[PDB]
Amino acid sequence: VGNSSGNWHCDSTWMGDRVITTSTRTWALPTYNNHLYKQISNSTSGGSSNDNAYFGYSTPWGYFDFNRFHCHFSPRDWQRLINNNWGFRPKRLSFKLFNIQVKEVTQNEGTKTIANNLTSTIQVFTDSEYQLPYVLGSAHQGCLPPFPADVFMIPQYGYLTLNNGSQAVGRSSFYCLEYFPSQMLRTGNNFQFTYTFEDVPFHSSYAHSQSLDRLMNPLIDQYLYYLSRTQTTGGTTNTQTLGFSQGGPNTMANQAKNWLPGPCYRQQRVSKTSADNNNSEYSWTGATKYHLNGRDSLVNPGPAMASHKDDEEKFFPQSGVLIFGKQGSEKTNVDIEKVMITDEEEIRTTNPVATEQYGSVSTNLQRGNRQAATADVNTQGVLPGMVWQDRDVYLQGPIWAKIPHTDGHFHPSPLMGGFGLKHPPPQILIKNTPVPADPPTTFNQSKLNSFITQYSTGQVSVEIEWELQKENSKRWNPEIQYTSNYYKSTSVDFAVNTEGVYSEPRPIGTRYLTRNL
Amino acid sequence: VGNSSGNWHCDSTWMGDRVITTSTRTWALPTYNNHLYKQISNSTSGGSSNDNAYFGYSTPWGYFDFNRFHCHFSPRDWQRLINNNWGFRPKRLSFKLFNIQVKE
Amino acid sequence: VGNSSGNWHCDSTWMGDRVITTSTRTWALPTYNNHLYKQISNSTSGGSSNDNAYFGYSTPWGYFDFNRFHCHFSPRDWQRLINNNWGFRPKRLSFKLFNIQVKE
Numbered sequence: 001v002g003n004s005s006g007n008w009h010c011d012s013t014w015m016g017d018r019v020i021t022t023s024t025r026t027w028a029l030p031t032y033n034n035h036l037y038k039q040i041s042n043s044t045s046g047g048s049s050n051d052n053a054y055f056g057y058s059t060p061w062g063y064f065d066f067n068r069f070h071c072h073f074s075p076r077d078w079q080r081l082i083n084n085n086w087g088f089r090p091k092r093l094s095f096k097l098f099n100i101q102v103k104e105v106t107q108n109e110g111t112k113t114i115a116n117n118l119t120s121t122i123q124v125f126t127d128s129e130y131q132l133p134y135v136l137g138s139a140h141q142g143c144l145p146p147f148p149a150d151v152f153m154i155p156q157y158g159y160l161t162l163n164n165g166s167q168a169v170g171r172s173s174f175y176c177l178e179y180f181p182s183q184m185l186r187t188g189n190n191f192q193f194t195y196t197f198e199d200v201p202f203h204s205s206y207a208h209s210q211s212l213d214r215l216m217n218p219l220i221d222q223y224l225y226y227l228s229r230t231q232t233t234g235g236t237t238n239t240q241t242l243g244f245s246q247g248g249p250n251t252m253a254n255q256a257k258n259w260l261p262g263p264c265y266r267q268q269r270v271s272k273t274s275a276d277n278n279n280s281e282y283s284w285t286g287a288t289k290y291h292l293n294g295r296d297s298l299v300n301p302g303p304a305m306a307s308h309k310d311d312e313e314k315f316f317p318q319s320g321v322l323i324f325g326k327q328g329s330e331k332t333n334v335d336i337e338k339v340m341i342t343d344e345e346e347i348r349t350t351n352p353v354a355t356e357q358y359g360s361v362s363t364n365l366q367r368g369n370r371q372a373a374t375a376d377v378n379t380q381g382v383l384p385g386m387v388w389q390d391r392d393v394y395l396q397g398p399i400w401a402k403i404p405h406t407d408g409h410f411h412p413s414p415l416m417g418g419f420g421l422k423h424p425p426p427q428i429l430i431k432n433t434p435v436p437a438d439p440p441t442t443f444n445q446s447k448l449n450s451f452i453t454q455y456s457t458g459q460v461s462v463e464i465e466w467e468l469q470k471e472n473s474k475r476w477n478p479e480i481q482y483t484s485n486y487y488k489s490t491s492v493d494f495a496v497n498t499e500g501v502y503s504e505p506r507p508i509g510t511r512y513l514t515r516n517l
Numbered sequence: 518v519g520n521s522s523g524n525w526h527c528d529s530t531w532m533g534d535r536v537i538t539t540s541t542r543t544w545a546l547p548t549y550n551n552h553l554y555k556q557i558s559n560s561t562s563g564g565s566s567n568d569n570a571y572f573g574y575s576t577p578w579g580y581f582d583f584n585r586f587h588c589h590f591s592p593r594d595w596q597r598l599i600n601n602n603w604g605f606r607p608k609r610l611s612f613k614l615f616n617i618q619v620k621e
Numbered sequence: 622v623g624n625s626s627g628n629w630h631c632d633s634t635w636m637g638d639r640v641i642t643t644s645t646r647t648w649a650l651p652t653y654n655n656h657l658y659k660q661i662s663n664s665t666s667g668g669s670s671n672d673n674a675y676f677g678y679s680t681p682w683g684y685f686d687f688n689r690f691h692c693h694f695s696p697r698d699w700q701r702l703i704n705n706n707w708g709f710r711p712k713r714l715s716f717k718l719f720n721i722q723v724k725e
């Protein structure tokens with residue numbers, strides 16, 4: 001009661017090959033659903049179409065979500081990681097919950113009184129067996145804020161199950177979170193928890209300096225021929241023939257290659273200048289969307305592909321990018337100066353542009369009378385010989401995602417970026433233990449529905465150790481570093497304004513340093 | 518005062534030949550009879566026939582009753598016990614009372 | 622000649638983490654192709670289209686095929702495996718052939 005449970009550690013430590021980023025924050029937990037598990041469906045949320053239909057449950061539990069890069073790295077630390085390392089991956093995590101206070105608010109006569117209840121507890125358990133629906137990795141809100149000065153409130157845990165419209169099917173499951181071994185904590189008690197990440201590939205935080213279709217020696221020809229000429233060129237009567245040429249420094253497009261660009265699933269190309277777009281509502285009609293059990297879902301951000309070709313910054317794939325929102329930006333139909341559209345153009349070297357055909361394939365058998373026809377390949381699954389890069393990471397974006405427990409998954413790297421994990425950091429769930437108001441003086445079999453209004457607060461630390469892969473570039477000229485532009489501004493970037501509101505002006509990725517292909 | 522007395526264990530463990538079902542709950546105890554032992558009879562409850570006649574005492578004490586199968590088994594655990602076993606019987610019990618608060 | 626070669630084992634054993642399903646059966650083997658290897662083709666089977674065309678050989682040999690789940694599991698054993706386990710895979714196999722009689 002009169003002794004702190006922990007201290008405030010919120011700094012990074014660089015040990016050459018690794019970096020340990022600690023981050024403490026203050027949280028607040030209200031009582032959700034008034035301590036009840038309520039069944040929710042698309043009909044309770046005000047009904048919807050069949051594509052938006054759902055069936056799940058709300059629970060009285062809140063959960064901690066530190067699955068974003070800005071909860072761990074400061075804008076400076078991120079820049080020191082982005083400009084010097086070629087890859088990075090997390091090694092171990094260490095979550096701690098302390099300095100717990102369970103305040104009891106009693107609203108009597110318009111006058112609000114908040115007093116601490118020293119004997120009240122909170123339950124907090126971590127599902128280490130992944131027996132509960134994993135909700136993190138869906139890019140939801142409620143993360144430790146990016147700025148350490150502010151306090152956040154803990155999001156409410158709710159899960160979904162199978163549905164047939166707004167109804168439940170036979171296999172729909174109901175999970176009671178009270179059926180797990182929680183750990184009651186009064187003020188004075190603390191919660192410590194450690195976790196060590198499985199072996200996941202380093203995140204390639206570099207761009208390639210060579211294009212996958214220009215990996216030859218521009219001074220030498222090949223010893224391999226290709227159909228160069230099919231028709232004797234002129235006379236007056238040019239006829240059918242067969243001429244073969246050797247690929248050379250002038251026919252780089254016709255040369256023979258060993259590899260192919262990564263897979264594709266074509267996207268619609270919209271312009272940031274609305275005057276260049278067709279005047280129709282194609283936000284849903286012209287979108288690329290997978291079909292699953294009769295209902296359509298937006299492929300967004302979809303698999304990994306370049307945003308635009310050379311010199312076309314104005315164009316972005318309709319769904320193929322991560323769009324973050326500037327500070328304070330609303331929720332609905334916000335305009336384009338209220339969001340920050342990421343630019344995945346550094347992978348145009350290996351991955352095909354999201355808004356263009358993958359290739360062209362012959363669709364018939366040319367003959368004396370039939371001539372050579374060809375089609376455009378919009379969707380192209382992997383093939384032996386393909387090579388591609390994964391989506392970037394974004395200091396504001398997600399860190400990991402749980403690889404779904406299926407018996408088949410190809411290249412389980414999350415489409416939103418990050419590290420795909422089969423055993424991701426577990427979900428730390430926490431709620432305020434109910435404290436009933438004065439019960440009747442005569443026995444009533446009915447469950448007590450009157451409770452003492454309370455909420456808890458306290459601090460939370462999260463230490464993560466990251467393994468780095470230092471850059472050993474033997475390049476001669478200088479590289480492209482991330483730098484704060486030297487020009488004078490009204491307010492510093494990644495700093496608080498004159499009202500104390502912290503804001504991240506732009507989305508920072510990792511691909512700055514270059515490397516050969 | 519500033520330290521919990523116990524934790525929340527409410528799950529079953531299956532060890533092949535036995536199953537241990539734990540179940541934690543939160544209770545509330547009011548003051549009964551205003552701390553008095555009162556003599557009760559069928560006449561105090563508003564009289565009755567001779568078949569419903571009685572004579573007993575009310576006490577200020579409450580009592581814990583976990584004598585029902587649903588206090589221990591969840592509908593799923595009960596189904597896993599009902600579909601696979603031919604018989605079952607209880608072996609040992611372990612009651613615990615903690616995190617006590619006496620509000621005024 | 623006057624002594625059996627083996628016994629009839631045809632039951633399953635559940636050891637918690639694994640199940641051993643034994644299954645004995647009686648077979649009969651006739652003489653195929655009259656002891657000859659004959660070349661067969663779609664034309665010998667009465668000709669066909671190009672999609673059904675083939676070329677292979679018939680042999681005088683028979684072969685044992687226990688590649689079906691019902692050769693090992695009984696409808697009850699299969700239900701006891703289907704309702705309680707999340708996955709299963711085979712670990713080892715043990716084939717035995719006995720009590721041979723060559724009737725003429």
Ligand SMILES: CO[C@H]1O[C@H](COS(=O)(=O)O)[C@@H](O[C@@H]2O[C@@H](C(=O)O)[C@@H](O[C@H]3O[C@H](COS(=O)(=O)O)[C@@H](O[C@@H]4O[C@H](C(=O)O)[C@@H](O[C@H]5O[C@H](COS(=O)(=O)O)[C@@H](O)[C@H](O)[C@H]5NS(=O)(=O)O)[C@H](O)[C@H]4O)[C@H](OS(=O)(=O)O)[C@H]3NS(=O)(=O)O)[C@H](O)[C@H]2OS(=O)(=O)O)[C@H](O)[C@H]1NS(=O)(=O)O
Pocket residue numbers: 364365367370
């Ligand atoms: C939409 O369908 C319609 O059009 C399509 C094509 O148009 S499209 O692509 O724009 O959609 C037609 O489909 C194409 O043509 C089909 C067809 O004509 O039947 C068919 O062609 C393939 O098979 C044909 C017959 O082959 S056979 O082995 O079954 O006989 C074939 O044409 C025949 O060529 C042979 C040949 O050149 O050998 C001819 O045989 C003659 O010569 C042989 C050898 O000559 S030699 O000198 O003696 O050595 C002799 O052995 C033979 O006795 C002799 N026959 S004889 O009767 O003239 O005496 C034969 O006569 C020809 O009919 C096609 O080859 S080709 O030579 O015509 O180029 C062959 N395809 S190919 O070789 O890859 O070109 C296919 O289904 C299809 O082929 S395609 O090239 O991909 O287009 C479709 O039939 C038509 N149907 S419709 O809409 O209902 O009218």
